[model samples]
Target: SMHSDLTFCEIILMEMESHDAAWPFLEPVNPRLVSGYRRIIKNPMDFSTMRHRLSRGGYTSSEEFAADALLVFDNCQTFNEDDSEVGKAGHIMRRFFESRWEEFY
Candidate 1:
């Protein structure tokens, strides 16, 4: 089993190279190919939506904006549960779904 948090994301964003080391650890033991990655959400007033919204508004793919959003939330981590435009996603993630954070990865 594995887990991730703001710092785990931090390594990818700020440190950059550490995620290369973590990749083998993350491969499924059997090492089969994955079809693709997707963010499964229903009615989500969350950080992930920001990328979708931005993509649609800007006429780009959500994938284009998603990585940028990830870094923003990484910086947005220093505070607590305050639902402002900047910190809302980060707060909601940690306060609500901390255990299920791997889905974001």
Candidate 2:
């Protein structure tokens, strides 16, 4: 059921936020702070945004939640170079989530 799925998503989200490399993905990118962010990344995703959505029951399924989670990393990679700190953090986070997802489902 979606209720269970949402619970799992909440668990995953909590762990992701607690990760040391999660600082970059903790909040929405401030356009004013980050030059041309709006122009470079069409869609933005972050832990805070996901948490808001979750609290509002915006996710109907775990897959939908996972998609948004992945988007955070996708946007990170798109905006930063692979060798860059944020980019590498995104890669690490992505790997971490993918493994946990497989383990649970």
Candidate 3:
């Protein structure tokens, strides 16, 4: 799972870099993003249960997921631009979950 998360993070980075307009706010990739990813990749035990639960279609709705996704993306963008503490925390939290592709599968 840790290896998978690392792979997912790489994919996200690649997607973000695919186009100039894509992930414009993600420029100068956040060190926290890498830090958070590395931590998760190294110690996935903390999230093993979460990873399992999310894989079981535990989420209530697509709307709920979409809403959360947008919120995270917005938070990342805002943090990248303003370096707000709240935004930084949000970005780190977002990175944690977004790194899980198995959740969506």
Candidate 4:
């Protein structure tokens, strides 16, 4: 099982990458799909509810971020598993972005 701190950090990075990559590709994709992508990318880091949850849990450090990445990779690599709901969803969402890149670029 991964720690909450590590899990939250991975969520932050995944959200950042998703949002960053989606922008350049946004104009070419279906408007609804683009909006959905943006929502997923922003929801985790959004200073609204989700951000408060992360900060409240002490998952706010670069070291924690790196630990989260390692834990996520190790869990997936070893057990072929995701330890959290958000981590699992992020894995799937990242695959979605990677698969559709050719259409945008």
Which candidate should be chosen as best, given TM-score against the real structure?
A: 2
What candidate 3 gets wrong by more than 4 Å, as runs, is 1-54, 82-105
Clashing pairs in 2: none
Model 2, position 69, has a per-residue lDDT of 94
Cα lDDT over the full model 4: 0.40
Q: Order the candidates by TM-score, highest first — what do you get?
A: 2, 3, 4, 1
Which digits, one per residue and each the tens of the lDDT, describe model 4 over residues 33-76?
A: 33454333322222132234344664555454444333333333
> Candidate 1 has which clashing residue pairs, if any?
none
The candidate, 1 or 2, that scores higher on lDDT is 2
TM-score per prediction, in order, is: 0.24, 0.92, 0.29, 0.29
Q: Which stretches of model 1 miss by more than 4 angstroms?
A: 1-56, 78-91, 94-105
Against the true structure, what is every candidate's RMSD? 15.1, 1.9, 11.3, 13.6
Please say which candidate is ahead in TM-score: 2 or 3: 2
lDDT of 3 by residue, 6-50 (tens): 344344434433434334233333455545533323222112232
Lowest summed lDDT window (length 10), candidate 2: 1-10
Q: For residues 14-95, could you state the per-residue lDDT of candidate 1 as single tens digits?
A: 2221323222212221215422211322122323343234434541432444444443334444332355543464554333
Number of clashes found in candidate 2: 0
- Best candidate, lDDT-wise? 2
lDDT of 2: 0.89
Decoy 4 TM-score against native: 0.29
Instruction: Give RMSD (Å) of candidate 2 vs. truth.
Output: 1.9
